[PDB]
Symmetry: C3
């Protein structure tokens, strides 16, 4: 398989209609957020893309979210996948909605792709066409702007990144040097959206280059 | 198996009767501690519970102790398990004693339990009936007080925690948000001991809930 | 196998002849460094030893380099191994040279050794006879001085370290307490070179002790 999509799956999900007040204080949750949606999943960068997407479909924001040390392959149980997102809303109906934009997007939104027919190397070269509060809460991102979200193993990623800046006028806005918790590297770029698509292509060209050879 | 106990095992053990002075300075060890017991083990939270228990049976304190990035399943060798505790004493007899309270407690003290008959999800819902200097050295714990020590994969843990505060008047004293080094989450609660047992039950009810469904 | 060598392998490699200026700024790269060599590999401490060795054969320095959370066994793809080194030079010929000192040294330089015939425990007890800018950039290392670089799982390492200070006048210069990203421990010692070899021996005696028993 060329760059056949990798179908992420949801690993667990629950809503706390009404957080205990004590647990809530420990979370630093605003007064306006008394319901939480919790969601685990197979693929972490995708789940962070679904989360942000939930921020646009519903009235929620992500209270929390972080990944697992050596990936889902190594996860501590079939439940935790390799991410945990914690959405907060003013009530349970808003949070359900955010939960369902997240599921529909994890199952059928952004996706990693195989780097090689051998399906032992994966990557993500995905245009987020309009950013919500999650992705745009990060340094230097404008709310509502387009963005590229690029991920690949360490050497793959560094090269492919360079390649991308060289292929399209974009702005490297964020760079996770190589060892993220899951052991990949990523960066966020910005510019137009037809450019975050020129950029998005050279990155995959460069990841496919290393796979086949480098 | 329902919540059949998981029998932790000790992976290695040695006493340095008399630390090199140079190694000692690098450890920031008091003047009153010239002997070290080193101990590795299968199950990290249990080993931290055994350590604290050693602080009560013998004159030692834990000089060090930390866990391994993706769990014992992923450990770097059959030796290191997924924890390393370093006990310090005024001499080798004290430290042996602490080492032996630790072994007897790792092998037959606190224990994880299976979340599901499928034995792919584990958790820990254990009352520490009286805390020594290790567990009580942590923020807001009283020396000699009771405590609950709750651990579970990320979504399991968050939910189960909320559940517990809601089931018994306890105090969330410490909270390790989701990705600890081993990829679980935990929290310490306090109150009575019959309550750290009401709390300890809803947590397991809530972990069993997600296993079977959520 | 006694302490049969473990043959590290290179997992990927590429040169960016000319970094994009934007990517370069994000790297904090000097004005004197416009070419990068990227290199991934099987064995991280060895690769950090090869890197430093490249600093002596060629005009390059390491711009970056870090390891992967649970080791190459758990790496995110067959490419990233468990390290990423990023060499910088004034041009592509210098960097090629550094890349080739690194390959020749990863494939046939420093090496882990099996702790036990069972080949489930590994370690590294290697004299770096003269240090370049990489290893010597670390606290308290003199440029051009000899050094011991000792690595072993957590309990193995702590013991073996103590053992080494006790066997030869050396100076513990750096100590990575137990859980490095790859889940081993290491330390750098200094003194003579016949001593960093007395030290280097007791460490392996002590790692072999735990393997067979402790
Ligand atoms: Hg893009
Ligand atoms: Hg309890
Ligand atoms: Hg040495």
């Amino acid at each position: 398989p060329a760059l056949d999509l990798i179908r992420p799956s949801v690993t667990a999900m629950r809503v706390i209609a009404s957080v205990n007040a004590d647990f809530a204080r420990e979370l630093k949750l605003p007064p306006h957020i008394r319901s939480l949606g919790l969601i685990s999943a197979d693929s972490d960068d995708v789940t962070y893309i679904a989360a942000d997407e939930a921020t646009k479909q519903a009235m929620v924001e992500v209270v929390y979210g972080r990944s697992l040390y050596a990936g889902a392959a190594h996860g501590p149980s079939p439940t935790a996948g390799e991410v945990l997102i914690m959405l907060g809303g003013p009530n349970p109906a808003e949070v359900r909605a955010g939960l369902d934009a997240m599921i529909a997007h994890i199952e059928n939104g952004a996706a990693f792709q195989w780097a090689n027919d051998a399906q032992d190397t994966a990557f993500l070269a995905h245009v987020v066409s309009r950013t919500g509060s999650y992705l745009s809460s990060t340094a230097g991102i404008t709310l509502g702007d387009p963005m590229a979200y690029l991920v690949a193993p360490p050497l793959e990623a560094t090269y492919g990144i360079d390649a991308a800046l060289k292929s399209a006028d974009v702005q490297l806005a964020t760079y996770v040097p190589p060892p993220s918790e899951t052991n990949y590297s990523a960066a966020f770029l910005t510019g137009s959206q037809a450019a975050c698509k020129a950029a998005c292509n050279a990155f995959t060209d460069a990841v496919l280059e290393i796979a086949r050879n480098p």
